């Protein structure tokens, strides 16, 4: 066969160890899921530093904890604007997922609270910024560089999927690179805890699996398709399906045809044909061996999965080095108290 006895026993034991870790992982998650933490800081504990972002539901601000001097990225959400945009369940669910998950490649919620007007999510601050900007700047990542990021995503999805969480918004825009060069997944606004199938049309056009486009029910296998899009974009510099309007992107997505740059290795193309697989009965991540089809693929043969999880692998790139930010009113009356009881 492909493996003699020693390699087969080693792989078997590693896979058994993953099950054991995931089982304890679920247990820790479910406790926090069933009893979420609330109100663990207040606004005047922080100095406003800089508005890093602004959006439909609120703003992101770099803040500095007055006591400890630590910096954080504080998502401020206008409760009334959340209500008017019909985003109550998404907001509640995002915070509830973030306070329950624990994984070295997932951005951590350090505090959360609310006041009369707003909801606040105080996150770990990642000054390196988004993968998107590094990728567009450098152009494309070499395959060993792309692979180091991909391995972290594979592990994170293996973790989330074991919790029955589908992530649904993978893209370089949502992947931050921390000061050791490792990935922080951000923005759980479209994540859903569901065991079976779900139907919501959501995600980013370039990254949508065909069965989302085709109005089928779908499951966690859409995240493995999105992994294929991500690996392709990291290694090519552009995504596998693009056009100037979304509708023409969807036509390419469902067509079952993808083309590769001539510098893609054959191992990479094989992996991507198995991830970017329209037929759900053939898509890696979705078969009887689950995620092991991906972890065991030839393109990941040099990947030490434990060393990656333990963050012992030297990153291929370290963003240039606290608080570097280069590369709000509170009503006397409480608004929307009932809607946000759980926050």
């Amino acid at each position: 066969g492909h493996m003699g006895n020693a390699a087969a026993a080693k792989k078997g034991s590693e896979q058994e160890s993953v099950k054991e870790f995931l089982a304890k992982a679920k247990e820790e998650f479910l406790k926090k899921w069933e009893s979420p933490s609330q109100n663990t800081a207040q606004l005047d504990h922080f100095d406003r530093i800089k508005t890093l972002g602004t959006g439909s539901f609120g703003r992101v601000m770099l803040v500095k904890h007055k006591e400890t001097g630590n910096h954080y990225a504080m998502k401020i959400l206008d409760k009334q604007k959340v209500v008017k945009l019909k985003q109550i369940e998404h907001t509640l669910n995002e915070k509830r997922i973030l306070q329950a998950v624990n994984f070295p490649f997932l951005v951590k919620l350090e505090f959360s609270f609310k006041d009369n007007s707003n909801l606040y999510m105080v996150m770990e601050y990642v000054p390196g910024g988004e993968m998107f900007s590094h990728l567009r700047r450098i152009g494309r990542f070499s395959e060993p560089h792309a692979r180091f990021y991909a391995a972290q995503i594979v592990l994170t999805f293996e973790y989330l999927h074991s919790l029955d969480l589908i992530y649904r918004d993978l893209k370089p825009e949502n992947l931050l690179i921390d000061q050791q060069g490792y990935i922080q997944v951000t923005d759980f606004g479209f994540a859903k805890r569901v065991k079976g199938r779900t139907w919501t049309l959501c995600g980013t056009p370039e990254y949508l699996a065909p069965e989302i486009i085709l109005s089928k029910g779908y499951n966690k296998a859409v995240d493995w398709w999105a992994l294929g899009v991500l690996i392709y974009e990291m290694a090519a510099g552009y995504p596998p399906f693009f056009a100037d309007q979304p509708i023409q992107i969807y036509e390419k997505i469902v067509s079952g045809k993808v083309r590769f740059p001539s510098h893609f290795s054959s191992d990479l193309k094989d992996l991507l044909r198995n991830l970017l697989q329209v037929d759900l009965t053939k898509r890696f991540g979705n078969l009887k061996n689950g995620v092991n089809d991906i972890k065991n693929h030839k393109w990941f043969a040099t990947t030490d999965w434990i060393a990656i999880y333990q963050r012992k692998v030297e990153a291929p790139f370290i963003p240039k080095f606290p608080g570097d930010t280069s590369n709000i009113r509170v009503s006397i009356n409480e608004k929307c108290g009932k809607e946000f009881t759980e926050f």
């Binding site: 998107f132 567009r136 825009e173 479209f190 049309l201 959501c202 995600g203 980013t204 056009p205 979304p246």
Partner: peptide, 18 residues
């Protein structure tokens, strides 16, 4: 070329969810 097509797509910037 594919890269030139990508540039011409107008979708080289940060992409919004639908």
């Amino acid at each position: 070329t594919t890269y030139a097509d990508f540039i011409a797509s107008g979708r080289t910037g940060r992409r919004n969810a639908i």
